[PDB]
Design a protein around this ligand. Structure first.
Ligand SMILES: Nc1nc2c(ncn2[C@@H]2O[C@H](COP(=O)(O)O)[C@@H](O)[C@H]2O)c(=O)[nH]1
Ligand SMILES: Nc1nc2c(ncn2[C@@H]2O[C@H](COP(=O)(O)O)[C@@H](O)[C@H]2O)c(=O)[nH]1
Ligand SMILES: Nc1nc2c(ncn2[C@@H]2O[C@H](COP(=O)(O)O)[C@@H](O)[C@H]2O)c(=O)[nH]1
Ligand SMILES: Nc1nc2c(ncn2[C@@H]2O[C@H](COP(=O)(O)O)[C@@H](O)[C@H]2O)c(=O)[nH]1
Lengths: 227, 231, 228, 213
């Protein structure tokens, strides 16, 4: 199951659809443990931390099955928090420890890549991305992990830089994808949500939600407190 | 309810002053294909009522609520004896972690865990077996007691046991349960620390089961016709 | 492989030996998190709780290798929330959830049993606890789980009762065994630690509820025995 | 015997007033057969130095010690981007659980996490805890410490999982273990990715070393 044409990157072709969270749908914050300093800025919860963990477990099972028997290289893109990647790796490590333990099944490799914005030399002057050297990914099966997909610009621009070194396959894992006017889709996606700005778990806003372990929409009270 | 430790014995089973459980509306479910389900349970499960991670987040919040109610007090927790998957094991895990990291409360006796059976449990002294109480409840005289139960459907087991416990004169009596079913029955028993309020349906998964069919199913669901038919 | 002659019960034949803890060998209690109320009764620690967890993970793996692909019935000699059986089952459940053959092997069964034949105390909706009738184990592969083996009399007696219903195989898992001065003394098949003959508290073990929140294992002190 | 945040800056690297680390005597090991080890690692692992569970129990105790020292104060924790983030991640995990279940009695802003390469203005007048996987020569923390002192923090302490008894120097304030002068791998340390899925700590064998050097 690990081979996939390079031209299918960003299409989510043949993927298992994410959990769908309908528009303006939430849980009551009073039903969950929330930090006392965040209470004044949170009244509703989008994704409970426990529901995030159940979907990340399922994505790790889906990933382990797609690459079983193959050497896998997982890239952690350094945008915002490292939260989602850490949780995903923890479950993949546990599954690896038992499923397929009896073989010369080489364990997965982890890699950390940084990005920097760059203005190309063309008549539009539009932005793109510059990466760390990626030559080590030649002829490898690569999984790129990103906290959330919003416009899809980061993974589109990054994707072209990685295509240039000729990897064997390229897929995307992300915790959330937004339904927006704002095209690129992931292959292993946790949730599909409405077009709103979220915080909590691996997301933040000026460190105000650094100890909040559930996902919520950024409120006007938080924007105000801060600004 | 919660809050102040002391509470009139007469309020047992009324859920007075409690923090209301998470409300799960009638006929509301999740897609089983979004979660990890054992292959052998798949023919019997199309929809999930409560994902296992949602169950754990609610148990964490109930452990918080309980700790705040009994802050600075000696607490006796009576667990209706269940197996490894019972609700009391997860609740105790969270209460033990909160207790271990509450440094300012080191002078308060840590909680005491007790096991009860609802029929006469016989034993032999000093033979190292588990101490399970049944006929003699005298150790609870003048103590703060919390009874922990997997689910309140009719609650008759808790009403009958509660009348026996009252006769020894405990200082306070409260109930913790993961799930309470909605009923039109008047004056039905209610818990004080309740995880979820659900429609009156029969559930399996997590601490619940039906002829061992869902012994490794880590989410809660309504017992289906195909599973009822398998027997 | 799951097969094993019934007469080999209690011999520990063909086992993987347990981790050996030498005589008078301890860790400093100041290096670990200990409940303040227990601090006056604990100066040395025998087994840190994380060392207990690493050995339980290894035992679970050993058990999974022995019974892979077979129908397994695990007997918990009744204990509460801190019993060794709960921790063992947590790791066995994880290996089972990710075993590699989750559609082609039957998941294990858990049973709750009393040591002696008392009158059943069962009722509808309550935990099934077996006492007087052990007949469900006829022709089954059975694993009996106990917190610790000292003299071995408990498991010898219970063992004779289970042999009367004719199980397919019988093995024993225990966290600790004691190095007592006997010959032909019962021993387990999946054992966490071999320790010197001393009386222990902490984790699944206790002494008059004094170590109910103590998550490491230690020897029982005279200060502790004095109090009570 | 103190658990208080204030501390003179000139005490940085001296380990003054610390709780000594667990002492692991020279030539003391555990049998590797008593633990779960990845099959591909087995031929390179002669014996184990520190079981993963022993590491976790020591990190939990360090986290408890850290929480008491800064209780009620705003704390800024720096993860030095040198080697693996394994030790920092485990330490933060325990500190976060203690914080979530500790004093819901107001104020005390929860701790902050920061990642530094190898600019510092944000640490002026702050309580700072610098986290490093292991201390060998002490050169990394001596150099970085002089740059941090320049911005004028309120206090500066160090947390590290292991310190080595090298040949006759910098010491941390919250230290897991004291070991002999050997090169280690596994759990939160690695060598050419060879021990990436190994959950316990061992000494790097010459067979492993010679595979790359
Ligand atoms: N906190 C937070 N960050 C977001 C959100 N949507 C996008 N981002 C950030 O913006 C980055 C760029 O996403 P893009 O628009 O390129 O797809 C993401 O990697 C993420 O860090 C959001 O809703 N909340
Ligand atoms: N599996 C399952 N057991 C239930 C359900 N409702 C009640 N029970 C069983 O009935 C017992 C006593 O119910 P109670 O008296 O507390 O309403 C519970 O401890 C539980 O084992 C249900 O929906 N599913
Ligand atoms: N707390 C504690 N209980 C023990 C110890 N040794 C034996 N036991 C208890 O004594 C029972 C009988 O052990 P036996 O001598 O029959 O093997 C065990 O099941 C256990 O409950 C010990 O060192 N500490
Ligand atoms: N894997 C491993 N890395 C070490 C060891 N000793 C030192 N290092 C690496 O060397 C870096 C600098 O140590 P220093 O000599 O500056 O104290 C550490 O942060 C760590 O990444 C060791 O025994 N094993």
């Amino acid at each position: 199951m690990a081979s996939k044409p390079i031209e299918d990157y960003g299409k989510g072709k043949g993927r298992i659809e994410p959990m769908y969270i309908p528009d303006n749908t939430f849980y009551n914050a009073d039903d969950f443990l929330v930090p006392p300093h965040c209470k004044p800025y949170i009244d509703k919860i989008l994704l409970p931390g426990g529901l995030v963990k159940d979907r990340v477990e399922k994505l790790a099972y889906d990933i382990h099955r797609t690459y079983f028997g193959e050497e896998l290289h997982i890239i952690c893109i350094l945008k915002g928090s490292r939260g989602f990647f850490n949780l995903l790796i923890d479950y993949l490590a546990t599954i690896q420890k038992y499923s397929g333990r009896e073989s010369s099944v080489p364990p997965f490799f982890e890699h950390y890549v940084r990005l920097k914005s760059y203005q190309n030399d063309n008549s539009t002057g539009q932005l793109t991305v510059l990466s760390d050297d990626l030559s080590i990914f030649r002829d490898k099966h690569v999984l790129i992990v990103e906290d959330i997909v919003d416009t899809g610009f980061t993974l589109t621009e990054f994707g072209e830089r990685l295509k240039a070194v000729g990897p064997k396959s390229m897929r995307i894992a992300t915790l959330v994808e937004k339904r927006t006017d704002r095209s690129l889709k992931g292959d292993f996606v946790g949730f599909s949500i409405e077009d709103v700005w979220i915080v909590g778990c691996c997301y933040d806003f000026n460190e105000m939600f650094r100890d909040f372990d559930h996902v919520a929409v950024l409120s006007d009270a938080a924007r105000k407190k801060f600004e």
